[PDB]
Amino acid sequence: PLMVKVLDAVRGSPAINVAMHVFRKGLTTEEEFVEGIYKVEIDTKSYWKALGISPFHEHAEVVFTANDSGPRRYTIAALLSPYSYSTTAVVT
Amino acid sequence: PLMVKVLDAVRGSPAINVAMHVFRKGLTTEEEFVEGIYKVEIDTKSYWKALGISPFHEHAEVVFTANDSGPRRYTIAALLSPYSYSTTAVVT
Amino acid sequence: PLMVKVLDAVRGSPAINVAMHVFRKGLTTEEEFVEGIYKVEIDTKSYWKALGISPFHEHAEVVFTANDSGPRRYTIAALLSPYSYSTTAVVT
Amino acid sequence: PLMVKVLDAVRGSPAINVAMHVFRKGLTTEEEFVEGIYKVEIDTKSYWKALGISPFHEHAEVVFTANDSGPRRYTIAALLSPYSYSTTAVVT
Amino acid sequence: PLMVKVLDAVRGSPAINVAMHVFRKGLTTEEEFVEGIYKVEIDTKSYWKALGISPFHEHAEVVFTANDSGPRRYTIAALLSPYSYSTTAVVT
């Protein structure tokens, strides 16, 4: 017998992130998995992936140039950070 | 017998994110999975993926240029961050 | 016997996000999955994907230029962040 | 008999991140796994991955240039850092 | 009989990160694992990985140049560092 208790009794307004998993029992292959439950991706790149079987097989002339530049700005407060009775501000 | 209890008794107005999973028991292949339950993607790129079987097989002349630039601005407060009795502001 | 209880007794007006899953038991293939229950995508790009079998097979002359630039602005407060008895403001 | 108790009795509004896992029992292959429950990725790159079987097999002339430059700015406060009765600010 | 108790009785609003795992019982292969529960990646690169079986097999002429430069700035406070009754600020 499996018994599980999380946050059984609560009073007074807390700020919570809850993630709970209970379990009982060809270029890319994946089976029976859990991914990215609380996940954040910012400015993520991917250029070539899984092009296939037999690409550029015979006499291929390829020029690959990847320029990553330019004025880019990212400003975040309280990323995956719950708070209570607090003050959060972004001022510019 | 599986018994599961989450946040059984609550009083006083809390701010909660809840994610609960109970379980009992060809370029890309995936089976029996859970992805991205609480997921955030910002400024995500992908150029070439899974082009197929036998691409550019014979005598291919390819020029690949990827320019990523330009004035881009991102401003976020309280990303995946629940709060209670608080103050959140973005001022410009 | 599977017994499951989430937020059985509540009083006092809390702000909640609930996601609950109970389970009992060819370029791209996917089977028996759950994706993107609470998902946010902002400024997401994808250029070439799954072009098919045998593309650009013989004597292909391709020029691929991807320019990503320009003045773009994103401003968000309380992204996937429930709150209670709080103050949220975006001021410009 | 498995008995599990986490945060059984709580009062006074704490700020919590909870991750709980209870378990009882071909270029890339993965099986029966959990990844990235509380994961943050910022400015992550990937150029070539899993191009396939037999790429550039015969007489391939490839020029690979990857320029990563440009004015980019990232500013974050309270990354995966819950707080209570505190003050968080980003001022420019 | 397995008995487990974490944070059984709490009062007074602490700031906590909780990660708990209870268990009872071909270029890349992985099985039955847990990765990156509380993981942060900043400015991470990967150029070539798992190109496939038999790449550049016969008479390959390759020039690989990877230039990593440019003005990039990263500023973070309280990375994976929960706090309580404190003050956190980033001032520019």
Side-chain angles (χ1 to χ4, degrees):
Chain A
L2 270 67
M3 188 180 181
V4 162
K5 294 170 60 189
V6 184
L7 291 162
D8 185 24
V10 175
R11 71 183 307 179
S13 83
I16 321 173
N17 273 318
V18 178
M20 174 178 142
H21 173 131
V22 174
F23 189 119
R24 183 172 186 176
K25 159 161 63 192
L27 300 191
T28 292
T29 303
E30 305 178 28
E31 291 182 25
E32 191 180 354
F33 65 93
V34 181
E35 279 192 359
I37 295 188
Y38 284 84
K39 189 163 164 49
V40 174
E41 304 187 38
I42 299 154
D43 198 8
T44 291
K45 313 99 179 178
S46 180
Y47 291 82
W48 288 11
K49 178 177 182 181
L51 293 196
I53 294 169
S54 160
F56 299 102
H57 192 92
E58 306 176 12
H59 301 73
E61 308 172 18
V62 187
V63 176
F64 181 94
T65 312
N67 302 119
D68 197 357
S69 66
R72 290 184 285 183
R73 173 177 279 96
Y74 306 80
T75 303
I76 308 177
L79 201 169
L80 270 170
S81 163
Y83 49 105
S84 67
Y85 290 86
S86 306
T87 301
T88 296
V90 180
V91 179
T92 297
Chain B
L2 270 67
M3 187 180 181
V4 162
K5 294 170 60 189
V6 184
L7 291 162
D8 185 24
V10 175
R11 71 183 307 179
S13 83
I16 321 173
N17 273 318
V18 178
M20 174 178 142
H21 173 131
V22 174
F23 189 119
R24 183 172 186 176
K25 159 161 63 192
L27 300 191
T28 292
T29 303
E30 305 178 28
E31 291 182 25
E32 191 180 354
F33 65 93
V34 181
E35 279 192 359
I37 295 188
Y38 284 84
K39 189 163 164 49
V40 174
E41 303 187 38
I42 299 154
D43 198 9
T44 291
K45 313 99 179 178
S46 180
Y47 291 82
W48 288 11
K49 178 177 182 181
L51 293 196
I53 294 169
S54 160
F56 299 102
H57 192 92
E58 305 176 12
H59 301 73
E61 308 172 18
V62 187
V63 176
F64 181 94
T65 312
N67 302 119
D68 197 357
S69 66
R72 290 184 285 183
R73 173 177 279 96
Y74 306 80
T75 303
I76 308 177
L79 201 169
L80 270 170
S81 163
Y83 49 105
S84 67
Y85 290 86
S86 306
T87 300
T88 296
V90 180
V91 179
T92 297
Chain C
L2 270 67
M3 188 180 181
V4 162
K5 294 171 60 189
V6 184
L7 291 162
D8 185 24
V10 175
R11 71 183 307 179
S13 83
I16 321 173
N17 273 318
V18 178
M20 174 178 142
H21 173 131
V22 174
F23 189 119
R24 183 172 186 176
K25 159 161 63 192
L27 300 191
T28 292
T29 303
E30 305 178 28
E31 291 182 25
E32 191 180 354
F33 65 93
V34 181
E35 279 192 359
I37 295 188
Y38 284 84
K39 189 163 164 49
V40 174
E41 304 187 38
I42 299 154
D43 198 9
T44 291
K45 313 99 179 178
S46 180
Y47 291 82
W48 288 11
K49 178 177 182 181
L51 293 196
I53 294 169
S54 160
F56 299 102
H57 192 92
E58 305 176 12
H59 301 73
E61 308 172 18
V62 187
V63 176
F64 181 94
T65 312
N67 302 119
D68 197 357
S69 66
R72 290 184 285 183
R73 173 177 279 96
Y74 305 80
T75 303
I76 308 177
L79 201 169
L80 269 170
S81 163
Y83 49 105
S84 67
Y85 290 86
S86 306
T87 301
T88 296
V90 180
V91 179
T92 297
Chain D
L2 270 67
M3 188 180 181
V4 162
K5 294 170 60 189
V6 184
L7 291 162
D8 185 24
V10 175
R11 71 183 307 179
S13 83
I16 321 173
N17 273 318
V18 178
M20 174 178 142
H21 173 131
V22 174
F23 189 119
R24 183 172 186 176
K25 159 161 63 192
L27 300 191
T28 292
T29 303
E30 305 178 28
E31 291 182 25
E32 191 180 354
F33 65 93
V34 181
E35 279 192 359
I37 295 188
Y38 284 84
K39 189 163 164 49
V40 174
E41 304 187 38
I42 299 154
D43 198 8
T44 291
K45 313 99 179 178
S46 180
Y47 291 82
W48 288 11
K49 178 177 182 181
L51 293 196
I53 294 169
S54 160
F56 299 102
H57 192 92
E58 306 176 12
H59 301 73
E61 308 172 18
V62 187
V63 176
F64 181 94
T65 312
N67 302 119
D68 197 357
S69 66
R72 290 184 285 183
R73 173 177 279 96
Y74 306 80
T75 303
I76 308 177
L79 201 169
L80 269 170
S81 163
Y83 49 106
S84 67
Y85 290 86
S86 306
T87 301
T88 296
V90 180
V91 179
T92 297
Chain E
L2 270 67
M3 188 180 181
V4 162
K5 294 171 60 189
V6 184
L7 291 162
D8 185 23
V10 175
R11 71 183 307 179
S13 83
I16 321 173
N17 273 318
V18 178
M20 174 178 142
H21 173 131
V22 174
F23 189 119
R24 183 172 186 176
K25 159 161 63 192
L27 300 191
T28 292
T29 303
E30 305 178 28
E31 291 182 25
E32 191 180 354
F33 65 93
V34 181
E35 279 192 359
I37 295 188
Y38 284 84
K39 189 163 164 49
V40 174
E41 304 187 38
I42 299 154
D43 198 8
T44 291
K45 313 99 179 178
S46 180
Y47 291 82
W48 288 11
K49 178 177 182 181
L51 293 196
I53 294 169
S54 160
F56 299 102
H57 192 92
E58 305 176 12
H59 301 73
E61 308 172 18
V62 187
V63 176
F64 181 94
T65 312
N67 302 119
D68 197 357
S69 66
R72 290 184 285 183
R73 173 177 279 96
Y74 306 80
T75 303
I76 308 177
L79 201 169
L80 270 170
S81 163
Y83 49 105
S84 67
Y85 290 86
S86 306
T87 301
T88 296
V90 180
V91 179
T92 297

